[PDB]
Amino acid sequence: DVNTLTRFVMEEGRKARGTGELTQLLNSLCTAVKAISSAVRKAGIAHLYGIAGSTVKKLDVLSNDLVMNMLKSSFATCVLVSEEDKHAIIVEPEKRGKYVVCFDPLDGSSNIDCLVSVGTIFGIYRKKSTDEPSEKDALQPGRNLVAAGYALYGSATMLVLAMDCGVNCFMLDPAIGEFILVDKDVKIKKKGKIYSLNEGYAKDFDPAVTEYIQRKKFPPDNSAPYGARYVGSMVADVHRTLVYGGIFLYPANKKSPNGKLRLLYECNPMAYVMEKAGGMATTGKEAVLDVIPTDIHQRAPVILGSPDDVLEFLKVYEKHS
Amino acid sequence: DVNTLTRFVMEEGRKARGTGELTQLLNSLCTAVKAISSAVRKAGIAHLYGIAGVKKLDVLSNDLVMNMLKSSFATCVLVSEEDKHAIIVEPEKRGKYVVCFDPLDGSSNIDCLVSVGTIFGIYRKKSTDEPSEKDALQPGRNLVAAGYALYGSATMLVLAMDCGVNCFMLDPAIGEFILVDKDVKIKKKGKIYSLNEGYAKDFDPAVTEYIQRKKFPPDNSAPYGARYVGSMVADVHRTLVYGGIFLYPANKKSPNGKLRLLYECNPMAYVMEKAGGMATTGKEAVLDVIPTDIHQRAPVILGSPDDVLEFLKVYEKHS
Amino acid sequence: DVNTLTRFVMEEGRKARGTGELTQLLNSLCTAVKAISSAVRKAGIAHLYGIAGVKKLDVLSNDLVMNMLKSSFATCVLVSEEDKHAIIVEPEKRGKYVVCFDPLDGSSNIDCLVSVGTIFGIYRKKSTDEPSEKDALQPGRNLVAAGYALYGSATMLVLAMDCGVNCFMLDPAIGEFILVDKDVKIKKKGKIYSLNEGYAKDFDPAVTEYIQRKKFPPDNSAPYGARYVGSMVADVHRTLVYGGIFLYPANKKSPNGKLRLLYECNPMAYVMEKAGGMATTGKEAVLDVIPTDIHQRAPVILGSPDDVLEFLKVYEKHS
Amino acid sequence: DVNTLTRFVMEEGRKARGTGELTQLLNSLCTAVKAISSAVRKAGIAHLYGIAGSTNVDQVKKLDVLSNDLVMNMLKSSFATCVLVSEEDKHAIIVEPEKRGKYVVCFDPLDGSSNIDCLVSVGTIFGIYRKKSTDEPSEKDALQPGRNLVAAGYALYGSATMLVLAMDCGVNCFMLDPAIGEFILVDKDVKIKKKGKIYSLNEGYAKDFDPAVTEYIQRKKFPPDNSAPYGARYVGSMVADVHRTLVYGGIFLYPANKKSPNGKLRLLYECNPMAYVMEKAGGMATTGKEAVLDVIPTDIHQRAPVILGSPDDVLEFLKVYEKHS
Ligand SMILES: *CC(=O)NCCc1ccc(S(=O)(=O)NC(=O)Nc2cccc(-c3ccccc3)c2)cc1
Ligand SMILES: *CC(=O)NCCc1ccc(S(=O)(=O)NC(=O)Nc2cccc(-c3ccccc3)c2)cc1
Ligand SMILES: *CC(=O)NCCc1ccc(S(=O)(=O)NC(=O)Nc2cccc(-c3ccccc3)c2)cc1
């Protein structure tokens, strides 16, 4: 039968007999994502351009406000880390719950003007310390995630939710404002045919990345070369990696020596989705999910996707170390 | 002062003292684009998955454009990426314009929710002969109007005509295309290059060297960034709004490239030239190619003029 | 073949060879009505209740209609139930039409969610002098177009002009008005009567007797049914669609009626007459009343012609 | 703090420490209501009129039938119901054993039939009981008096879409925001006015009125104490008329006459849910002889008379009615 996000989570949440708090958190997040989607699709833009006479908020800020407010009022969270905010937000005591959430409310906003995909990325942790809530509660390794995923505001809006039972994909039906389950227990292809990275950094690449990409374009075994795709929005590039397989790279380069993407709310959520889908995600040195963060906005290199492709890259990496 | 597409084009048409047929055409096209956008955003998908107890999206998109244009009384010949032969409008509905379109561009990848789009070019029928595919075999220089709809994070219609390029954002709350950027011009030189570098082994030597200069600039300037969505509408629109260069050039598998002249290259080349950019095959302007087959391919390199001219310098060096 | 409000008006306008101003006006009204419908259905209400951490609807609806009509370049004088004096369009946006409208008919009503609507009447400015409130003082016989949008279970625009009455359903998936009922004609005689019987104490004897004939018919037919929503657009639209009669008569506690002649009675009378119905004050056709004040009231009895004639027979008895 | 139907119900239930089955039921009901609302507002009607050339024709079902299919399918798949009674089908629907939950639902999927083509308000009425018999579930489990209701209410598809939900604590109203498909709490713990100024019934039937009804309506048009006469409103859709009665006060009547000596409306999925909403809002609902909620049904489709609304107005009707006994 048909299933919706709310019903799917409600029913899985009744089964494993948890405190109900994660279900409440996810439902509040879903509401925020639907509201972001509506704003990203520009519903009501006519009023901004004077339809009612001579006359609000950048999408970035509004998306952050929507996630912040819905998570606060879920009574399920205590610490919230957002790409938008310099410091972690500590939820007021009367609305504090069990969970810590790191999120990027509108990934890809530097591509909004060209209208390409934007998205929301989130990662959810159980607060581990009994201390008063603080930034330190978000400094957990991605291995500690209890749920993670993203919403892609693409040609359609889809929510990908990873939990320790696997990855499930929901399509927003805007006629009824309902996320419909359309792909259950998804697994990434063992090996793909697409590679995805910004090759404009070629001058600054490590020898390992340089060699690996040369193998994709000029296969030593004379097989067909991989195709290339790079949207430049991480949700779009990672989602395509999930559904068609292949490999996504945002390595450190000489000008971003610790990486470009942010560990807490870009790399770790996507690494968790990948691993729950049977894929891999590495910094080169170690699994993304094993990095122990020290700073909430710290960066990380990331190479992720189909296991055979990531293993091949790691083989090239070991040769150059 | 707020402007919808409907109001804008009609007011422009009055000042041009036309009959109104082209305005009627564009209105019918916009209605089709709104319907494509709604289906692309998956309105009603809950019913397909059983909420109450499977045509392809680009077939439906083709049917929408075909039906809306036929019933506009403004068209006589319709060439679609979707259809083997040109469609001849029934005599009682024939108007004076010929439309070439790709109803859902980039749609072999809707599975990843990548941007998709609709591309269109509109010609005046040039002879009084009985309508046929020959009426669609005009060089892009002959275009009366061209553009695209981009179904991305939001839905946008870019409309190019003799006057220039104007961009309209679809407000889905009221189904109006609102004018948001007027008389758009591309920047003289950009900092993004866009092509499928997985073809690298088969590149023409000039393409190899040009792309090498983007990554390793001989003057030690900043390397260009790379973007390649693999959807023509998305890649061209980014080129328009940010500047830079987009390439689908000729080589081995493809002495004529791979994109199609009538409903991919020509509409995009026309938008580009009206916005102050360029679009070349490497040997000529795209808009100067006289087609002989409605599905014929053309190489295309387009975008900011300084970038396209720099590509042509490397191209001549290898010629 | 499918048709839309925009395409229907535009093809009808190009045919008639008028100045195009009426087409521009109706398109601007279309846009305003879709924006009102969106707001009436409470799109975005979550933001009012703090989802991210200010006008009432009647005011917003007035602003939408006023702004969109002004920017149509088709109007010169605008009369709204919301504004004490007529609005004079500034010289650089002036066209030749006068519009009287009720931007959101239904007031003691929004809070209980029953149907509301927008009513409009479009008169042509005869004179050649500077426009003023006096130009809106014209009989309904000078209407060139009139109708209403009903925001009910669905949103419908009913448009009457000299060719007759046509009904368009708003498809909110694509934000387009779809032609669904062409050349509408009201039933010759209906079976429903519609008025507020709470005024029975103050009813004129002719109204009292007519209503008794509906409840106890002199020929032993079945009694009429009664329906009274209390929103004029809803009651009149039901009258048009199912037949019957609608009454807001002069009671002794207000001898000129309650409803306003210019932007409630006249537009509805015009729709009715163009659909083969009738609309009377009791003494004369609503459309023949010559107003002396833009907000003057008039009694109205309208609907199926045999039903209005039967009321008039009773009315002439009490003389 | 903003509140949605889902979150509001979720946390009221945790306070009551229920199983969560009722919350699950209500969530699935809300999904059906959103789908009904989208169809009633005519989303996609352009495809019915040939926008894509008439190759694309659900969609073609009448709204009545679609609405029943939507409610039936979402309640079945909720895993919260065992017996479902709809106006549409002669017999009660018994949920497949695999999907069986503990609740019984009686509903009117799209109240207002002679009424869609003129675009008047339509709506969805529902009443929710707990199964009590230990037997295999059967039609008999729906034959409970309105007093046993766990929850009831309606969706009104009017100028906007509103869900009114009554439970033993009281009545709450949620506005559907169609931009995001969320029911927003806009009016909490709603109470009806003690006495109103509007009366609601089909006066075209006057020839067939009970003399008690005739007298009462005469009293509202020509008050004996020389007070202002009441205003009259009759939409002809029960959900619209009852919602107006709830919001503005007054009285709504569908009493016994000639075409129907037992009234016209159906007890299980029209009269009882509105009677439960009214009583939870401080109002009344009588057949004339007894409370609607105290009628013990023997037939899932039996009719009942109903007079409901502001308590002072209903009491006054009852005094006239007793005087004609
Ligand atoms: C920037 C630019 O190139 N603008 C011109 C775009 C354009 C649009 C449409 C046409 S058209 O051939 O379709 N003609 C019209 O739209 N004509 C028109 C519109 C509105 C009103 C009237 C009119 C004129 C005179 C009397 C009554 C009505 C005509 C051409 C160019
Ligand atoms: C059934 C009925 O009553 N039909 C008459 C409807 C009608 C609509 C509009 C007009 S008009 O006075 O506004 N005149 C025009 O619209 N004239 C016109 C001439 C040429 C071109 C155009 C046009 C319209 C739309 C887009 C482009 C060009 C309009 C009169 C009667
Ligand atoms: C006004 C009024 O009467 N409110 C009560 C409404 C109500 C709604 C739903 C139910 S229920 O039977 O379905 N039970 C729940 O919803 N229970 C519930 C919700 C959320 C979380 C938890 C929970 C409790 C303990 C541990 C984990 C999770 C339970 C009852 C009354």
Coordinates of C-alpha atoms in Angstrom, one line a residue, chain A:
Chain A
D1 CA 0.0 0.0 0.0
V2 CA 0.8 3.7 -0.3
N3 CA 3.0 5.1 2.5
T4 CA 3.8 8.6 3.6
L5 CA 6.9 9.8 5.5
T6 CA 4.8 10.6 8.6
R7 CA 3.1 7.2 8.6
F8 CA 6.3 5.3 7.8
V9 CA 8.1 7.0 10.7
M10 CA 5.1 6.8 13.1
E11 CA 4.8 3.1 12.5
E12 CA 8.5 2.3 12.7
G13 CA 8.7 4.5 15.8
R14 CA 5.9 2.5 17.5
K15 CA 7.6 -0.7 16.6
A16 CA 11.1 -0.2 18.0
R17 CA 9.5 1.3 21.2
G18 CA 11.6 4.5 21.5
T19 CA 10.7 7.6 23.4
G20 CA 8.8 9.1 20.4
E21 CA 11.1 12.1 20.3
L22 CA 12.8 11.1 17.0
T23 CA 9.4 10.8 15.4
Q24 CA 8.5 14.3 16.6
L25 CA 11.8 15.7 15.4
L26 CA 11.4 14.1 11.9
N27 CA 7.8 15.3 11.6
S28 CA 8.9 18.9 12.5
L29 CA 11.8 18.7 10.0
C30 CA 9.4 17.4 7.3
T31 CA 7.1 20.5 7.8
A32 CA 10.2 22.8 7.6
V33 CA 11.3 21.1 4.3
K34 CA 7.8 21.5 2.8
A35 CA 7.9 25.2 3.7
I36 CA 11.4 25.6 2.3
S37 CA 10.3 23.8 -0.9
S38 CA 7.4 26.2 -1.4
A39 CA 9.6 29.3 -0.9
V40 CA 12.4 27.9 -3.2
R41 CA 9.8 27.3 -6.0
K42 CA 8.9 31.0 -5.6
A43 CA 5.3 30.7 -4.5
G44 CA 4.1 34.3 -3.8
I45 CA 7.0 36.0 -5.7
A46 CA 4.4 38.1 -7.4
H47 CA 3.8 40.0 -4.2
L48 CA 7.4 40.8 -3.9
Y49 CA 7.2 42.4 -7.4
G50 CA 4.3 44.7 -6.6
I51 CA 1.2 42.8 -7.6
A52 CA -0.8 44.4 -4.7
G53 CA 0.8 47.8 -5.0
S54 CA 4.1 49.6 -4.3
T55 CA 6.4 47.4 -2.2
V56 CA 11.2 40.1 2.4
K57 CA 14.0 37.8 3.5
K58 CA 16.8 36.0 1.6
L59 CA 15.9 32.3 1.0
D60 CA 19.1 31.4 3.0
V61 CA 17.9 33.1 6.2
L62 CA 14.3 32.0 5.8
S63 CA 15.3 28.4 5.4
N64 CA 17.4 28.6 8.5
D65 CA 14.6 30.2 10.4
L66 CA 12.2 27.5 9.3
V67 CA 14.4 24.6 10.4
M68 CA 15.5 26.4 13.7
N69 CA 11.9 27.2 14.7
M70 CA 10.4 23.8 13.8
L71 CA 13.2 21.9 15.5
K72 CA 13.0 24.1 18.6
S73 CA 9.3 23.6 19.0
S74 CA 9.5 19.9 18.4
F75 CA 10.6 19.5 22.1
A76 CA 13.0 16.9 20.8
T77 CA 16.3 18.9 20.5
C78 CA 18.8 20.6 22.8
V79 CA 21.7 21.8 20.6
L80 CA 21.4 23.0 16.9
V81 CA 24.3 23.6 14.6
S82 CA 23.6 25.4 11.4
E83 CA 25.8 26.4 8.5
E84 CA 24.1 29.8 8.8
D85 CA 25.1 30.4 12.4
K86 CA 28.6 31.1 13.8
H87 CA 27.9 29.5 17.1
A88 CA 25.7 26.5 18.1
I89 CA 22.2 27.4 19.2
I90 CA 21.3 26.0 22.6
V91 CA 17.5 25.3 22.9
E92 CA 15.6 27.0 25.7
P93 CA 15.3 24.7 28.7
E94 CA 11.5 24.4 28.5
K95 CA 11.7 23.1 25.0
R96 CA 14.8 20.9 25.4
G97 CA 14.8 17.3 24.2
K98 CA 17.3 14.5 23.7
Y99 CA 18.7 15.2 20.2
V100 CA 21.4 17.3 18.6
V101 CA 21.0 18.4 15.0
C102 CA 23.5 19.6 12.5
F103 CA 22.2 21.0 9.3
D104 CA 22.8 23.1 6.2
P105 CA 19.3 24.7 5.7
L106 CA 19.9 25.6 2.0
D107 CA 23.0 23.9 0.5
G108 CA 23.8 25.4 -2.9
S109 CA 22.6 28.9 -2.3
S110 CA 25.6 30.2 -4.3
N111 CA 23.8 28.6 -7.3
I112 CA 20.3 30.0 -6.5
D113 CA 20.6 32.7 -9.2
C114 CA 21.2 30.1 -11.9
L115 CA 18.2 28.1 -10.5
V116 CA 20.1 24.9 -10.2
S117 CA 19.3 22.5 -7.4
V118 CA 19.5 23.6 -3.8
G119 CA 18.9 21.3 -0.8
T120 CA 18.8 20.8 2.9
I121 CA 21.2 18.5 4.7
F122 CA 20.8 17.2 8.2
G123 CA 22.4 14.9 10.7
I124 CA 20.9 13.9 14.1
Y125 CA 22.7 12.8 17.2
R126 CA 21.7 11.7 20.6
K127 CA 23.2 14.1 23.2
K128 CA 25.9 12.0 24.7
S129 CA 27.2 14.0 27.7
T130 CA 25.2 14.8 30.8
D131 CA 26.7 18.3 31.0
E132 CA 24.7 21.4 30.4
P133 CA 24.0 21.5 26.6
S134 CA 26.8 23.3 24.6
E135 CA 28.6 23.3 21.3
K136 CA 30.6 20.2 22.5
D137 CA 27.5 18.1 22.1
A138 CA 27.7 18.4 18.3
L139 CA 31.4 17.3 18.3
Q140 CA 30.6 13.7 17.8
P141 CA 31.9 11.5 15.1
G142 CA 29.5 10.6 12.3
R143 CA 29.6 7.0 13.5
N144 CA 27.3 8.2 16.3
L145 CA 24.5 9.4 14.0
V146 CA 21.1 8.0 14.6
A147 CA 19.5 9.5 11.4
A148 CA 20.7 11.6 8.5
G149 CA 19.6 12.7 5.1
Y150 CA 18.7 15.5 2.8
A151 CA 15.9 17.2 0.8
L152 CA 16.7 18.0 -2.8
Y153 CA 14.7 20.9 -4.3
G154 CA 15.3 19.8 -7.9
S155 CA 12.9 19.2 -10.7
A156 CA 10.8 17.6 -8.0
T157 CA 11.4 17.8 -4.2
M158 CA 12.6 14.6 -2.7
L159 CA 13.6 13.6 0.9
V160 CA 16.2 10.9 1.4
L161 CA 16.1 9.6 5.0
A162 CA 18.8 7.3 6.3
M163 CA 18.4 5.4 9.6
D164 CA 20.1 2.4 10.9
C165 CA 17.4 0.3 9.1
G166 CA 18.6 1.6 5.7
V167 CA 17.8 4.4 3.3
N168 CA 14.3 5.4 2.1
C169 CA 13.3 8.0 -0.5
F170 CA 10.2 10.1 -0.4
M171 CA 8.7 12.3 -3.2
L172 CA 6.9 15.5 -2.1
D173 CA 3.5 15.6 -3.9
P174 CA 2.8 19.3 -3.9
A175 CA -0.9 18.8 -4.7
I176 CA -1.4 17.4 -1.1
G177 CA 1.8 18.5 0.7
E178 CA 2.7 14.8 1.5
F179 CA 6.0 13.0 1.2
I180 CA 5.2 9.7 -0.6
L181 CA 7.5 6.7 -0.2
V182 CA 8.7 5.9 -3.7
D183 CA 12.1 4.0 -3.1
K184 CA 12.4 1.6 -0.2
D185 CA 15.7 0.2 1.3
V186 CA 17.8 1.7 -1.5
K187 CA 21.3 0.4 -2.2
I188 CA 23.9 2.1 -4.4
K189 CA 25.3 0.2 -7.3
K190 CA 28.5 -1.8 -6.6
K191 CA 30.3 0.1 -9.4
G192 CA 29.3 3.1 -11.4
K193 CA 30.1 4.8 -14.7
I194 CA 30.2 8.5 -13.6
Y195 CA 32.7 10.6 -11.8
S196 CA 31.9 14.0 -10.2
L197 CA 34.3 16.7 -9.1
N198 CA 35.3 20.3 -10.0
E199 CA 38.2 19.8 -12.4
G200 CA 38.9 23.5 -12.3
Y201 CA 41.1 22.7 -9.3
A202 CA 43.3 20.4 -11.5
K203 CA 46.4 22.6 -10.9
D204 CA 46.1 22.1 -7.1
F205 CA 45.2 18.4 -6.9
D206 CA 47.2 15.7 -5.1
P207 CA 49.0 13.2 -7.3
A208 CA 46.5 10.6 -6.2
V209 CA 43.4 12.5 -7.3
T210 CA 45.2 13.4 -10.6
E211 CA 46.1 9.8 -11.2
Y212 CA 42.6 8.5 -10.4
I213 CA 40.8 11.0 -12.7
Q214 CA 43.2 10.0 -15.5
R215 CA 42.1 6.4 -15.0
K216 CA 38.5 7.5 -15.4
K217 CA 39.2 9.3 -18.7
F218 CA 41.9 6.9 -20.1
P219 CA 41.1 3.5 -18.6
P220 CA 44.3 1.4 -18.6
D221 CA 42.2 -1.7 -19.3
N222 CA 40.9 0.2 -22.4
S223 CA 37.3 -0.1 -21.2
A224 CA 34.9 2.8 -21.8
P225 CA 35.7 6.0 -20.1
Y226 CA 33.5 7.2 -17.3
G227 CA 31.1 10.1 -18.0
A228 CA 31.5 13.3 -16.0
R229 CA 28.8 15.3 -14.2
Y230 CA 29.3 18.2 -11.7
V231 CA 26.4 20.4 -10.6
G232 CA 28.3 22.2 -7.9
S233 CA 25.6 21.6 -5.3
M234 CA 26.5 18.8 -3.0
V235 CA 22.9 17.5 -2.6
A236 CA 22.5 17.2 -6.4
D237 CA 25.8 15.6 -7.0
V238 CA 25.5 13.2 -4.1
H239 CA 21.9 12.2 -5.0
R240 CA 22.9 11.4 -8.6
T241 CA 25.8 9.3 -7.1
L242 CA 23.2 7.5 -5.0
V243 CA 20.7 6.7 -7.7
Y244 CA 23.1 6.0 -10.7
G245 CA 26.2 5.0 -8.8
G246 CA 29.8 6.2 -9.4
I247 CA 32.0 8.5 -7.4
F248 CA 31.9 12.0 -6.0
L249 CA 35.0 13.9 -4.9
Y250 CA 35.7 17.1 -3.1
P251 CA 39.3 16.6 -2.0
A252 CA 41.5 19.0 -0.3
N253 CA 43.5 21.1 -2.7
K254 CA 46.5 23.4 -2.1
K255 CA 44.2 26.3 -1.5
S256 CA 41.8 24.4 0.8
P257 CA 44.3 22.2 2.5
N258 CA 41.8 20.8 5.1
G259 CA 39.1 20.3 2.5
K260 CA 36.3 22.6 1.3
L261 CA 33.1 20.9 2.5
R262 CA 32.1 21.1 6.2
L263 CA 32.4 17.9 8.3
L264 CA 29.4 18.3 10.6
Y265 CA 26.5 19.1 8.2
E266 CA 27.8 18.2 4.7
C267 CA 30.3 15.3 4.8
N268 CA 29.0 13.3 7.8
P269 CA 25.3 13.2 6.7
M270 CA 26.2 12.2 3.2
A271 CA 28.7 9.7 4.5
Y272 CA 26.0 8.1 6.6
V273 CA 23.5 7.9 3.8
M274 CA 26.2 6.3 1.6
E275 CA 27.2 3.7 4.2
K276 CA 23.6 2.8 5.0
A277 CA 23.1 2.4 1.2
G278 CA 26.1 0.0 0.9
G279 CA 28.5 2.7 -0.3
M280 CA 31.6 4.2 1.1
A281 CA 32.9 7.7 2.1
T282 CA 36.5 8.4 2.9
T283 CA 38.8 11.4 3.5
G284 CA 41.6 9.4 2.0
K285 CA 43.1 8.8 5.4
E286 CA 40.1 7.3 7.2
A287 CA 36.3 6.9 7.0
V288 CA 34.5 10.3 7.1
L289 CA 32.3 8.8 9.9
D290 CA 35.4 8.2 12.0
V291 CA 36.8 11.7 12.1
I292 CA 36.5 13.1 15.6
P293 CA 35.5 16.8 15.2
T294 CA 37.1 19.6 17.2
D295 CA 35.3 22.6 15.7
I296 CA 31.7 22.8 14.5
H297 CA 32.5 24.5 11.2
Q298 CA 35.6 22.5 10.4
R299 CA 36.2 21.2 6.9
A300 CA 37.0 17.8 5.6
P301 CA 38.0 16.2 2.3
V302 CA 35.5 13.7 1.0
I303 CA 35.4 10.9 -1.6
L304 CA 32.2 8.9 -1.6
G305 CA 30.0 6.7 -3.6
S306 CA 30.0 3.2 -5.1
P307 CA 32.2 0.9 -3.1
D308 CA 34.3 -0.5 -6.0
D309 CA 35.0 3.1 -7.2
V310 CA 36.0 4.3 -3.7
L311 CA 38.2 1.2 -3.2
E312 CA 39.9 1.9 -6.5
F313 CA 40.6 5.5 -5.5
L314 CA 41.9 4.2 -2.2
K315 CA 44.2 1.9 -4.1
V316 CA 45.6 4.9 -5.9
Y317 CA 45.9 6.8 -2.7
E318 CA 47.9 4.0 -1.0
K319 CA 50.3 4.0 -4.0
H320 CA 51.0 7.7 -3.5
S321 CA 51.6 7.5 0.3

